[PDB]
Amino acid sequence: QEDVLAKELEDVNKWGLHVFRIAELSGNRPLTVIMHTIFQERDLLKTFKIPVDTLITYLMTLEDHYHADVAYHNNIHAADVVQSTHVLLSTPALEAVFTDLEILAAIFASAIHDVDHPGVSNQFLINTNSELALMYNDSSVLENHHLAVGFKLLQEENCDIFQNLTKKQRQSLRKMVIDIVLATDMSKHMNLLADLKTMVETKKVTSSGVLLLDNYSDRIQVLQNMVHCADLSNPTKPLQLYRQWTDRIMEEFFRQGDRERERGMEISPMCDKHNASVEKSQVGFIDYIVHPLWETWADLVHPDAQDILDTLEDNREWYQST
Numbered sequence: 001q002e003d004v005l006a007k008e009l010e011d012v013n014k015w016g017l018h019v020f021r022i023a024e025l026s027g028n029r030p031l032t033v034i035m036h037t038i039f040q041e042r043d044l045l046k047t048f049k050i051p052v053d054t055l056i057t058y059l060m061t062l063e064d065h066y067h068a069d070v071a072y073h074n075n076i077h078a079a080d081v082v083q084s085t086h087v088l089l090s091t092p093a094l095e096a097v098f099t100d101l102e103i104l105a106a107i108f109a110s111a112i113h114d115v116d117h118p119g120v121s122n123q124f125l126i127n128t129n130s131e132l133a134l135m136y137n138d139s140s141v142l143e144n145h146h147l148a149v150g151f152k153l154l155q156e157e158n159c160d161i162f163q164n165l166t167k168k169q170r171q172s173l174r175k176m177v178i179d180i181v182l183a184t185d186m187s188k189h190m191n192l193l194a195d196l197k198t199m200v201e202t203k204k205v206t207s208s209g210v211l212l213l214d215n216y217s218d219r220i221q222v223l224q225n226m227v228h229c230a231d232l233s234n235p236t237k238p239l240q241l242y243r244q245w246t247d248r249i250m251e252e253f254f255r256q257g258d259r260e261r262e263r264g265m266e267i268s269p270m271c272d273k274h275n276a277s278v279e280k281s282q283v284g285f286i287d288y289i290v291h292p293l294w295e296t297w298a299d300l301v302h303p304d305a306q307d308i309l310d311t312l313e314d315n316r317e318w319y320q321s322t
């Protein structure tokens with residue numbers, strides 16, 4: 001069984017890795033084994049003097065604080081975003097653009113970006129006067145919490161994977177990780193996309209042909225949009241993968257809508273299981289959210305992302321046809 005898993009982990013650089021098989025083959029440890037593979041592949045353990053045992057211990061503790069009883073925002077989603085961010089970082093147009101520390105931040109941010117998600121939305125947590133909304137004053141409630149949990153777990157026994165970074169390395173990475181995860185709040189999508197559009201229109205490229213990023217503001221904005229693309233990458237994946245993600249988000253949405261109805265509240269869009277239109281909503285989401293973003297990303301790394309954008313367009317057509 002370990003040999004099959006190791007075979008499937010050979011695809012870690014490929015879009016459309018079969019993350020669900022890896023979850024099964026790893027005994028519900030997709031986040032740990034994919035993170036470990038990626039760190040090996042990028043030589044991050046040697047670069048940052050990360051002890052192997054510390055890495056596994058942190059990864060397992062972090063994976064544990066994703067909820068196995070949440071159908072979408074679980075450890076499989078986290079592994080998927082890590083792996084998708086890992087592939088997006090390897091695109092030719094970005095070669096040698098980001099430092100080792102920035103690659104570490106983006107991968108680490110992807111791994112913690114939804115930890116301890118309870119499977120309800122920010123707006124539900126606000127409307128139900130939840131403790132989380134109360135702690136974070138109704139602003140990026142989930143996103144602030146994922147960051148606080150992800151960083152806090154570094155303090156558990158033999159969990160500080162950043163113990164051999166310099167103080168300035170830690171401080172720079174923490175800030176970058178915060179900037180990235182806070183940008184995954186969907187209420188920020190439009191401002192993030194508008195900013196990425198502006199950057200593509202004024203895009204500058206080096207003599208080697210690679211994207212030129214002058215300053216923190218441009219670098220962090222590309223890393224924020226990269227992780228945001230990886231977060232919204234389900235509809236760019238091969239259809240058998242995309243369909244399982246759709247099934248899982250609808251289970252989680254529907255269960256929020258039951259809670260909402262049980263409490264007298266109006267049902268949030270896509271959460272009413274007596275008035276759903278699964279296929280229509282996927283097309284709506286692609287047309288108004290996912291495709292505008294992925295088309296803008298494709299222009300930034302043109303033509304590196306043309307197969308991913310083509311798969312998205314085919315998957316949109318297929319859902320439309322139904």
Ligand SMILES: COc1c(O)cc2oc3cc4c(c(OC/C=C/C(=O)O)c3c(=O)c2c1CC=C(C)C)C=CC(C)(C)O4
Pocket residue numbers: 073114121122123186187231232234235242245246249269270285
């Ligand atoms: C109200 O705006 C909408 C909306 O109008 C339709 C939507 O539709 C979806 C559809 C989704 C998924 C969706 O989730 C994306 C991933 C989130 C994560 O990992 O946290 C959504 C939406 O979130 C969504 C939102 C955004 C929600 C809020 C509260 C601003 C995830 C996976 C796939 C299969 C792509 O389907």
Ligand SMILES: [Mg+2]
Pocket residue numbers: 113114142184185
């Ligand atoms: Mg999230």
Ligand SMILES: [Zn+2]
Pocket residue numbers: 077081113114231
């Ligand atoms: Zn997410």
